[PDB]
Write an enzyme that holds these catalytic residues in place. Sequence first.
Site, PDB file in Angstrom:
ATOM      1  N   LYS A 157      -1.802 -27.515  -2.874  1.00 31.31           N
ATOM      2  CA  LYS A 157      -1.788 -26.027  -2.990  1.00 31.31           C
ATOM      3  C   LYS A 157      -0.339 -25.504  -2.992  1.00 31.31           C
ATOM      4  O   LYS A 157       0.588 -26.276  -2.674  1.00 31.31           O
ATOM      5  CB  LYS A 157      -2.645 -25.393  -1.887  1.00 31.31           C
ATOM      6  CG  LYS A 157      -4.058 -25.960  -1.733  1.00 31.31           C
ATOM      7  CD  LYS A 157      -5.085 -25.562  -2.799  1.00 31.31           C
ATOM      8  CE  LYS A 157      -6.379 -26.355  -2.683  1.00 31.31           C
ATOM      9  NZ  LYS A 157      -7.566 -25.600  -3.070  1.00 31.31           N
TER      10      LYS A 157
HETATM   11  C1  PLP Z   1      -8.760 -25.768  -2.475  1.00 34.21           C
HETATM   12  C2  PLP Z   1      -9.778 -24.660  -2.658  1.00 34.21           C
HETATM   13  C3  PLP Z   1     -10.794 -24.337  -1.728  1.00 34.21           C
HETATM   14  C4  PLP Z   1     -11.078 -25.100  -0.462  1.00 34.21           C
HETATM   15  O1  PLP Z   1      -9.904 -25.657   0.185  1.00 34.21           O
HETATM   16  P1  PLP Z   1      -9.916 -26.966   1.114  1.00 34.21           P
HETATM   17  O2  PLP Z   1      -8.725 -26.693   2.012  1.00 34.21           O
HETATM   18  O3  PLP Z   1      -9.723 -28.143   0.182  1.00 34.21           O
HETATM   19  O4  PLP Z   1     -11.227 -27.044   1.882  1.00 34.21           O
HETATM   20  C5  PLP Z   1     -11.629 -23.293  -2.020  1.00 34.21           C
HETATM   21  N1  PLP Z   1     -11.532 -22.549  -3.139  1.00 34.21           N
HETATM   22  C6  PLP Z   1     -10.594 -22.820  -4.039  1.00 34.21           C
HETATM   23  C7  PLP Z   1     -10.525 -21.967  -5.264  1.00 34.21           C
HETATM   24  C8  PLP Z   1      -9.692 -23.877  -3.828  1.00 34.21           C
HETATM   25  O5  PLP Z   1      -8.753 -24.114  -4.771  1.00 34.21           O
END
Ligand code: PLP
Lengths: 420, 419
Positions: free
Chosen positions: B191
């Site tokens: 991210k």
């Molecule tokens: C990464 C992500 C999530 C969930 O994140 P995690 O930390 O992997 O549980 C939810 N929605 C979107 C759009 C994401 O990119």
Amino acid sequence: SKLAAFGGPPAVPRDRRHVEWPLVEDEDRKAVIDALDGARNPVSTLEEQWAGRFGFGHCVAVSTGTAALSLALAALGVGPGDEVIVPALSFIATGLAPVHQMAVPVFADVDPVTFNLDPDDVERRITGRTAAIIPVHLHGAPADMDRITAIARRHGLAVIEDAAQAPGATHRGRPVGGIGDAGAFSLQATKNIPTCGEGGLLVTGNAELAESVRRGRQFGEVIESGRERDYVSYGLGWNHKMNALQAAFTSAQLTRFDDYESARQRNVAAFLARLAELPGLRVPTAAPDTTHAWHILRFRFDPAAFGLDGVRPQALRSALRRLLRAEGVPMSQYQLMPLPDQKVFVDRVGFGGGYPWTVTGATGPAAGEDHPVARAVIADSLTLQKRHLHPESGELLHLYADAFEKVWANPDMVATLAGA
Amino acid sequence: SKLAAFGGPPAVPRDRRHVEWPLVEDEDRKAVIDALDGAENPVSTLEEQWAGRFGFGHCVAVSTGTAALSLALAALGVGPGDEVIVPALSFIATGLAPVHQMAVPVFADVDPVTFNLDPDDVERRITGRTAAIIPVHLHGAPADMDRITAIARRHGLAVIEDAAQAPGATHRGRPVGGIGDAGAFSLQATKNIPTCGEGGLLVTGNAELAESVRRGRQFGEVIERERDYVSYGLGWNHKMNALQAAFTSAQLTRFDDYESARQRNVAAFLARLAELPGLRVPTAAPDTTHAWHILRFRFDPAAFGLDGVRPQALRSALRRLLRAEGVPMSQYQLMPLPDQKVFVDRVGFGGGYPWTVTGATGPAAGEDHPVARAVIADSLTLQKRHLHPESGELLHLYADAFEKVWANPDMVATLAGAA
Ligand SMILES: *Cc1c(COP(=O)(O)O)cnc(C)c1O
Ligand SMILES: *Cc1c(COP(=O)(O)O)cnc(C)c1O
């Protein structure tokens, strides 16, 4: 040699009380930084090492011990309309894991000496809805697995061992976690083989159960090194992934486990030997043909031994707690109430609208008997947590024994304080 | 230059292709080491730092972005018998969070340009059971929060922003996450503001909502007083790791420096690609900024004289030719979320829960959401490489690759048309 509670010198000096747990060595720090710079797989490395060390067919690393339990229930087909029998005395996670998989937890009373779920009471709480039993190896003492497995085979129930507090513990010489259909371990920072934060391991002999957990921990996806992620999910999954850094840290911890384990066993044995001689003090024990991990030391105190024919056991508990803490022994409670008394299990709201209880129609008052043994154990017991886990705590436990012997040498003062 | 696919030199030499993410500096290493040695607390510190940077009243650090979404639903009283409207194009966690809280996800189609929940399709899918909407700021583009918040307020629904892909993005100058009743962020290693592994943040202006999530993440307990193990409601182990919190604090300190480089690099990259006929560069909607977590491009077969042919044929031809040049072009989602087995089968936890509470049904595989399907059919994505502040020259090499491929439309057409 006056009691510290009344101005006397403490049996444990202030500068001797601190214990570091987890015990972080340079090898731990290097393992974490190497995992950070490696940019990756420490998780599968921990899975292989844990399975290898403790003789399990499969190990799936997950986020938490709680997730190990809930993914185990999911893998074993436990869900809406199912009841899961768990002990009335445990960490709340044991009772919540069924709720997390939309199953109803059913609380069995415990043994007055082992503090583990009484197989006789388990039998009494079986219904047509019972699908599984979660025996807990509470405080590090393996549960009555011969009886639990016998009951499970009779009624066609799944067995998931909650081994969170019992790494290295054995039942008839067998590593705990490998006796049930699956076993749950917690690598939480306070546990006997800790990580630097949170972690869980699910172990099983069943390849299909392992694969279910492996998918369930990562949104129901199949994840492989060198294969581009297609985001194809094969069922209901969560984010229950272990952190690589935490996995690397625990791998480092495992290289000292045998040495740390030897020290704990020797240190705890010597400590309990001295306390066992004190009248009205019941030291914790391993049941026959088991070995104890000694995660938590729970002591039961008998008012009879202090001539307190009338005094509520809680009054003696309070008095001993105050006096022992003044000497510098950090005596605690572990659980103030049986799990059935916890608001979540009393209100039975769950996710909302009474689910999961609404499925079974168990929305009104709880079925079956009270849990008088769980209540009695809480009423008259204090615990030592953390301090005895450190391999160099030998001298500290010697001073703890000094403090206990000192308190027991003032029985009139104990009786007086218990009186108020 | 001659195409790499036909023996030419790749536009991107292999020694330029690798991009480190997360970008680990000595301050990250020291933050992690200090967290181990530390034995006030890094989690609390990150909560304050994140709230302060993005102007939120409350920040609750949790295990994952997924846990942030499900705890947000729990806190807003969403559960059995409720429906939650989510986009048909997203990461699966957006669709799973309602199921995790024993609610039914209802999929609305996305906009063909923004790739975000189309408010025109949300209104149609509201029922007596709808309790909430989860708009996703997908790829880093803030959703149409004017129309999503208006729909919610008009229908008495809760709004939870899935801002996982859009940290630092704004809508009418407002930090995303702070517009809905609650906002979820992911600190997963991939991210825009990553941790060294897994992490989540729940943000809200509502003190009571924050307190619910705070209890929910730790078995329903109140933690500061010795641990009494008293639980006040249904909770999980959704605790963040202190080490990951400390790492993210270090990353957050450099975030806007990385933002500045990233925004310059992507803008220059997209300006070059925007000149190529039949190539639609991704865009920020009016009154928004884009976080550029993922770059999704749509390709028009008409531009290559393939008007008759399945767009997937052009998509496959362009992917092959660009990857040969050294551009790591990917898909992001092969199918709309409602085609995923979990949403098609509607088994859930077992015995069809949560669908069984209501007897709610969904669409079969392939049934609905034509725009989500159209976008998947003709689009490729760039992930990760453009996130690094030093990737300026690399993205110019990617643009060289695109320009080479577009200078050979006959060869694109031949590949697209071939068996
Ligand atoms: C990464 C992500 C999530 C969930 O994140 P995690 O930390 O992997 O549980 C939810 N929605 C979107 C759009 C994401 O990119
Ligand atoms: C610690 C513990 C758990 C849960 O472990 P987490 O890793 O904290 O989720 C479950 N049962 C028992 C008995 C425990 O001690």
